[PDB]
Design a protein around this ligand. Structure first.
Ligand SMILES: *[C@@H]1O[C@H](CO[C@@H]2O[C@@H](C)[C@@H](O)[C@@H](O)[C@@H]2O)[C@@H](O[C@@H]2O[C@H](CO)[C@@H](O)[C@H](O)[C@H]2NC(C)=O)[C@H](O)[C@H]1NC(C)=O
Ligand SMILES: [Ca+2]
Ligand SMILES: [Ca+2]
Ligand SMILES: [Ca+2]
Ligand SMILES: [Ca+2]
Ligand SMILES: [Ca+2]
Ligand SMILES: [Ca+2]
Ligand SMILES: [K+]
Ligand SMILES: [K+]
Ligand SMILES: [K+]
Ligand code: NA
Length: 551
């Protein structure tokens, strides 16, 4: 409630300067591995100015920009100073195990027609090169001149090669959303011929909307990647993956169309830890939503549980859900833009309860309050590898301000585990679901972020806080449905586990058991008895991960 969660470390780790943290207009931020060396770099969309690629130097304890102003540098093209970048994400589009980097540029346009193309950078011929406008693609209808906002990776058919969802901002009947991916039939990767196509129309997502936020993962799907678009001046879309690379909108039916509000930052999470994916998002000067997935009438239906404080209107941009203090409960961070007046950032803990809905608790964001911050973007990542998530905030639009960097103040003695699933080709498995079964605390769910938070993309890591507890096993579900269950050894606690795509006896913890298919599932205590309920509360009710006894 009262103790400050964050300390600013900007001045020691990323001081305002010309080269690495300029006073400029920045927008989205994405975390990926740019130099294939295992560590993650932080890619910043420069709206007026170069894009930044920040790499942690342990010797100096600094984030240093490696996209230096040097034409001979392999990173030089990434600067794209002429591009007015807003959205960014990174995804392996060609299946080489390395991520490409997409910048949505919005030069001279709020909406409709823009004057400079988006960029999709790939490392080849020993340097980063734009492939959207190269010989192969320039006439293939994949580089267009539209305003837009967020982008996100989508493993559309479970192939392990990503499509990139492009949330364009239409003006009338100009500027539909796009879904860009590799065209295998026109590609020859042995010769570096990477042919792209837009499949938005055939996939069912070619819509004319005021695009804002996007999130991707198994929301209604058990394993396949659905797409949630929180738009403005109209309904949100909840694109249910049909299993054949196509999507059908289900938002109105599911109760998340929210047609009279204007979405910004968005994240997918399981707040009540019932294994069903929930949706949190900010509404621009509107009632922020925390939608728990429920199953009313055998049909799926989301229910808002936002408290009055949580839903208090603000000029929200970035929304992130993460366990900043490793205490097992997710926090939600709101990066507000102080464009007309002071507008403090907000932090809430969402506390799973034994009975009923989670409890929403306002926290003190400490140095991350930033009442004068023009917040435009942000990410979480553990860039220094100490097991505590770090927070980076970008600022811009209406006032040039440097990036800010924060470390957490709380939960140092709590346990943690970080899980990194890989695709069948060795890339970050964006869109994968990771479930951690704890010894006594039930099951925690993460989705690896392919794009979230409005304009951003978080590190490709399922970061679990374990509090005082320990892990029994992990379970990874890839978008294609492959599921791997693995015990976590004692010595693997408080570390990063890599989980490879599949080319010890299983521990499922309390409330769960290994089924005939080899995977952990809920134990039904009500039938697995010596009878569990006492005389005075004799009716047993089975729950996911537990049970309750009532009268
Ligand atoms: C892609 O699949 C959709 C959905 O197919 C239905 O749901 C799937 C999960 C599976 O159960 C299928 O057998 C179902 O048909 C197709 O849309 C359906 O198409 C049929 C045939 O025209 C139609 O009668 C259904 O009403 C459609 N259902 C929905 C929900 O739209 C779609 O045609 C498939 N497209 C391609 C190109 O394969
Ligand atoms: Ca790296
Ligand atoms: Ca690649
Ligand atoms: Ca849930
Ligand atoms: Ca927490
Ligand atoms: Ca850290
Ligand atoms: Ca149970
Ligand atoms: K730029
Ligand atoms: K909306
Ligand atoms: K702010
Ligand atoms: Na654009």
């Amino acid at each position: 409630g009262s103790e400050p969660m964050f300390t600013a470390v900007t001045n020691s780790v990323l001081p305002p300067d010309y080269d690495s943290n300029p006073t400029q207009l920045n927008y989205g931020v994405a975390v990926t591995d740019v130099d294939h060396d295992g560590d993650f770099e932080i890619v910043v969309a420069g709206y007026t100015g170069p894009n930044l690629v920040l790499k942690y130097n342990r010797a100096q304890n600094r984030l240093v920009n490696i996209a230096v102003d040097e034409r001979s540098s392999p990173y030089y093209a990434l600067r794209d100073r002429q591009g007015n970048a807003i959205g960014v994400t990174a995804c392996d589009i060609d299946g080489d195990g390395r991520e490409e980097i997409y910048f949505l540029n919005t030069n001279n346009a709020f909406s409709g027609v823009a004057t400079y193309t988006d960029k999709l950078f790939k490392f080849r011929n020993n340097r980063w090169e734009d492939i959207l406008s190269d010989d192969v693609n320039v006439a293939r209808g994949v580089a267009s001149l539209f305003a837009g906002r967020s982008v996100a990776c989508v493993d559309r058919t479970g192939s392990g090669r990503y499509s990139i969802y492009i949330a364009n901002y239409a003006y009338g009947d100009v500027g539909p959303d796009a879904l860009i991916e590799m065209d295998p039939e026109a590609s020859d990767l042995s010769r570096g011929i990477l042919a792209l196509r837009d499949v938005a129309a055939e996939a069912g997502v070619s819509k004319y909307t005021a695009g804002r936020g996007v999130s991707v993962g198994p929301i209604l799907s058990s394993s396949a990647s659905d797409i949630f678009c929180d738009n403005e001046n109209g309904p949100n879309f909840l694109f249910h993956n049909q299993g054949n690379g196509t999507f059908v909108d289900t938002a109105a039916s599911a109760g998340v169309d929210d047609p009279h509000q204007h979405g910004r930052g968005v994240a997918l999470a399981d707040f009540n830890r019932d294994g069903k994916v929930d949706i949190v998002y900010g509404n621009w000067n509107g009632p922020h939503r925390l939608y728990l997935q429920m199953s009313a009438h055998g049909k799926v239906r989301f229910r808002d549980i936002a408290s009055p404080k949580f839903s208090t209107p603000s000029p929200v941009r970035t929304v992130i859900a993460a366990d900043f203090d490793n205490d097992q409960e997710l926090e939600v961070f709101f990066n507000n833009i102080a464009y007309r007046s002071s507008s403090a950032n907000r932090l809430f803990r969402v506390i799973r309860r034994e009975h009923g809905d989670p409890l929403i608790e306002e926290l003190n964001p400490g140095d991350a309050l930033e009442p004068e911050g023009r917040g435009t973007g942000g990410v979480v990542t553990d860039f220094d590898g100490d097991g505590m998530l770090d927070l980076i905030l970008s600022h811009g639009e209406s006032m040039a301000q440097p990036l800010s960097v924060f470390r957490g103040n709380q939960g140092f003695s709590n346990n943690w585990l970080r899980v990194v699933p890989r695709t069948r080709f060795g890339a970050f498995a964006r869109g994968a679901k990771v479930v951690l079964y704890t010894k006594k605390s039930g099951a925690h769910l993460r989705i690896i972020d392919g794009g979230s938070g409005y304009l951003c993309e978080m590190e490709p890591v399922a970061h679990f806080g374990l509090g005082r507890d320990e892990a029994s096993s992990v379970e990874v579900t890839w978008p294609d449905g492959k599921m791997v269950s693995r015990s976590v050894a004692s010595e693997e606690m408080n570390s990063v586990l890599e989980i490879l795509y599949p080319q010890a006896p299983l521990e499922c913890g309390q409330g769960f058991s290994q089924q005939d298919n080899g995977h952990c599932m809920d134990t039904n205590e009500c039938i697995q008895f010596p009878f569990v309920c006492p005389r005075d509360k004799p009716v047993c009710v089975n729950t996911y991960g537990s049970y309750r006894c009532r009268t």
